[PDB]
Amino acid sequence: KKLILDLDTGVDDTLAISYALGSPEMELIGITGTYGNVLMEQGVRNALAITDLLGHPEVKVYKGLSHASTKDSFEVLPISAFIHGDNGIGDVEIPDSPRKAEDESAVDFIIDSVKKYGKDLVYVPTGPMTNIAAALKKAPEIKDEIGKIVLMGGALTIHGNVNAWTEANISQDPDAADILFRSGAPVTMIGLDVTLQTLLTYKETKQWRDLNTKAGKFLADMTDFYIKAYETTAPHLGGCGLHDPLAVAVAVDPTLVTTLPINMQVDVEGPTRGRTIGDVTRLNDPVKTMQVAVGVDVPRFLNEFMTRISGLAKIA
Amino acid sequence: KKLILDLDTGVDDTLAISYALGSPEMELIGITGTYGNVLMEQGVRNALAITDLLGHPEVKVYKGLSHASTKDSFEVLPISAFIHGDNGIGDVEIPDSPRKAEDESAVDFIIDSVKKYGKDLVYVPTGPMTNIAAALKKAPEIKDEIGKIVLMGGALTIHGNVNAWTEANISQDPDAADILFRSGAPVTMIGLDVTLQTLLTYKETKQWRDLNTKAGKFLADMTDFYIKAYETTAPHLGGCGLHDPLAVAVAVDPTLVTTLPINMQVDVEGPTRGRTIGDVTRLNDPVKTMQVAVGVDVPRFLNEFMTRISGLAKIA
Numbered sequence: 001k002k003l004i005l006d007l008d009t010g011v012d013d014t015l016a017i018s019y020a021l022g023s024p025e026m027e028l029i030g031i032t033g034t035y036g037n038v039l040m041e042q043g044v045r046n047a048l049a050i051t052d053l054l055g056h057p058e059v060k061v062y063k064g065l066s067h068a069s070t071k072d073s074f075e076v077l078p079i080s081a082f083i084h085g086d087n088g089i090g091d092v093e094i095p096d097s098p099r100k101a102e103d104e105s106a107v108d109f110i111i112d113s114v115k116k117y118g119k120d121l122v123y124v125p126t127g128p129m130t131n132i133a134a135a136l137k138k139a140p141e142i143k144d145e146i147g148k149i150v151l152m153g154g155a156l157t158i159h160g161n162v163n164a165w166t167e168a169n170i171s172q173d174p175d176a177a178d179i180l181f182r183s184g185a186p187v188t189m190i191g192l193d194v195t196l197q198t199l200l201t202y203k204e205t206k207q208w209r210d211l212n213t214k215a216g217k218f219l220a221d222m223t224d225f226y227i228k229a230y231e232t233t234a235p236h237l238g239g240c241g242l243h244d245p246l247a248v249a250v251a252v253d254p255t256l257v258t259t260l261p262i263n264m265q266v267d268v269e270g271p272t273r274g275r276t277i278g279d280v281t282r283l284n285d286p287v288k289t290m291q292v293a294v295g296v297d298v299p300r301f302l303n304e305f306m307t308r309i310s311g312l313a314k315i316a
Numbered sequence: 317k318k319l320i321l322d323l324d325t326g327v328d329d330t331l332a333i334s335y336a337l338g339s340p341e342m343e344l345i346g347i348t349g350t351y352g353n354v355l356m357e358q359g360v361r362n363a364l365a366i367t368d369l370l371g372h373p374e375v376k377v378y379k380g381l382s383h384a385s386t387k388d389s390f391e392v393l394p395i396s397a398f399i400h401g402d403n404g405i406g407d408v409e410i411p412d413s414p415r416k417a418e419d420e421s422a423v424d425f426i427i428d429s430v431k432k433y434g435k436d437l438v439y440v441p442t443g444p445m446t447n448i449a450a451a452l453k454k455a456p457e458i459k460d461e462i463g464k465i466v467l468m469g470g471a472l473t474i475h476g477n478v479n480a481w482t483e484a485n486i487s488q489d490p491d492a493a494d495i496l497f498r499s500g501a502p503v504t505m506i507g508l509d510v511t512l513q514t515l516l517t518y519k520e521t522k523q524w525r526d527l528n529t530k531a532g533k534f535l536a537d538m539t540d541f542y543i544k545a546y547e548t549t550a551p552h553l554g555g556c557g558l559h560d561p562l563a564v565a566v567a568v569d570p571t572l573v574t575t576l577p578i579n580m581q582v583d584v585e586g587p588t589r590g591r592t593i594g595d596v597t598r599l600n601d602p603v604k605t606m607q608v609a610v611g612v613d614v615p616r617f618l619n620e621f622m623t624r625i626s627g628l629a630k631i632a
């Protein structure tokens with residue numbers, strides 16, 4: 001079984017990389033780069049540099065799209081610059097990788113990877129869906145050929161985090177997210193309804209410091225910036241959410257989550273634009289195209305998370 | 317076990333009465349009257365007249381509130397006048413009951429009934445929540461004293477029917493619905509996500525005509541107006557939804573539905589005003605105050621529905 005991450009790297013996005021590389025059930029083929037937490041290019045610089053630091057410079061980083069499906073440009077919002085920092089990695093200084101982005105676009109890498117690995121391929125996007133929307137656009141065959149998609153984004157049964165009805169990764173490109181959900185590809189949405197139950201504090205990051213490694217000190221320094229940002233943006237939690245890693249955890253082990261079979265859409269037109277919600281049209285259709293996560297085994301996920309990442313940090 | 321309906325009577329609302337009176341597990345104590353499908357008073361005229369027609373003039377009809385929690389007045393919207401008719405009963409001519417509404421308000425009847433029957437009481441509102449909001453307002457003890465509330469209204473995982481995010485009964489008084497959901501009373505929401513899976517066509521109403529009774533001919537004539545309205549307002553279904561009856565069916569037999577334990581709210585302030593949605597604040601609280609219906613045994617419900625109502629129609 002073989003894994004592609006699609007990342008706006010990104011603090012939680014590197015924790016997804018760390019969980020992936022700490023997990024022996026998947027071979028991480030490549031990291032597709034996208035935008036949001038940080039500018040698209042910055043996403044690639046970080047991906048390369050971090051994959052190197054953890055001891056896996058075989059991870060080939062491809063180059064996705066800079067702006068949204070229906071926008072001309074993109075700037076990083078100052079809110080996301082406060083949370084993930086300016087570099088998008090806390091503000092942790094880390095040497096640039098001398099490796100660089102692959103020649104082909106990430107759009108084509110996905111399409112190619114689908115035709116190579118078929119149902120062994122698992123695509124886990126924890127940034128905007130912009131990339132796989134363009135992939136499904138150019139090559140709609142993907143739907144049936146791909147093994148499974150397992151995204152982080154949206155909020156079904158709960159308030160979003162950007163506004164009352166939309167979540168960040170969906171907010172940045174709703175139209176793309178709609179195309180994906182409607183596509184009929186075997187998607188598993190892991191939204192806020194499950195990720196806001198996840199938590200880690202300095203109790204957990206102090207364990208990474210105890211390993212005394214280049215990687216251990218990095219991940220600790222990084223997520224401590226992320227927690228101190230959360231201390232002001234959401235003091236009602238105490239630490240930080242484990243959003244993007246959980247998507248990867250469910251990709252490897254779908255029993256970590258309890259899903260609700262449901263044909264879905266994303267709202268494009270109304271004043272609820274960017275909301276993840278069931279399509280009424282396909283309610284009575286018994287064949288459910290995707291599944292939204294509603295319950296989660298938080299203590300087992302937190303143990304799986306620390307075991308995998310602390311094991312990887314010991315290796316570098 | 318003892319039942320109170322809270323009805324904007326109402327085409328589907330009389331089907332709820334019919335299911336209730338056809339069900340031997342509950343004694344229907346009274347029908348609290350409310351507004352929406354038709355003017356509040358008209359709700360009472362119909363309730364009295366219909367309870368008589370089915371062979372149960374012991375059902376005491378009480379008088380709830382005319383307008384919403386936060387409004388001065390109320391008019392019937394022309395959309396609901398098209399669906400349920402002008403009289404609110406198709407346009408089926410039926411003799412007025414010479415019995416009239418009880419002296420006390422329905423607000424007080426509920427509060428009194430809670431203190432009399434305690435945990436044997438089951439309150440099943442398939443109109444606006446306006447009435448039980450005022451009851452919980454005046455007497456908040458109800459929460460813990462009452463057996464269970466089982467409403468019809470809202471839409472959690474799907475588009476509403478008034479707009480993309482709100483359902484009729486919640487739309488008419490959102491602020492009341494919020495008060496109920498937040499109250500912590502043992503509510504079970506049966507919203508569109510489950511009721512739009514229910515269906516009946518002329519195949520089913522022709523069976524009621526075959527019984528040759530006063531009641532059989534009435535219910536057939538009535539729901540055929542309701543289906544011909546649905547033929548224009550929603551030709552994607554073919555017949556009509558069994559919205560309000562299903563709430564009663566789940567009150568008698570909660571195994572007809574698969575619920576999702578979830579602390580809920582109703583949106584009051586935003587441009588999503590009137591939306592039924594989980595409260596994030598109480599997501600990590602393990603104690604779930606109410607449960608939203610997401611799955612349903614449609615063929616068993618449809619059989620239970622016809623068995624009970626055709627049995628009752630044979631009696632008149």
Ligand SMILES: [Ca+2]
Pocket residue numbers: 008010012013037126127169244
């Ligand atoms: Ca992200």
Ligand SMILES: [Ca+2]
Pocket residue numbers: 324326328329353442443485560
């Ligand atoms: Ca009704």
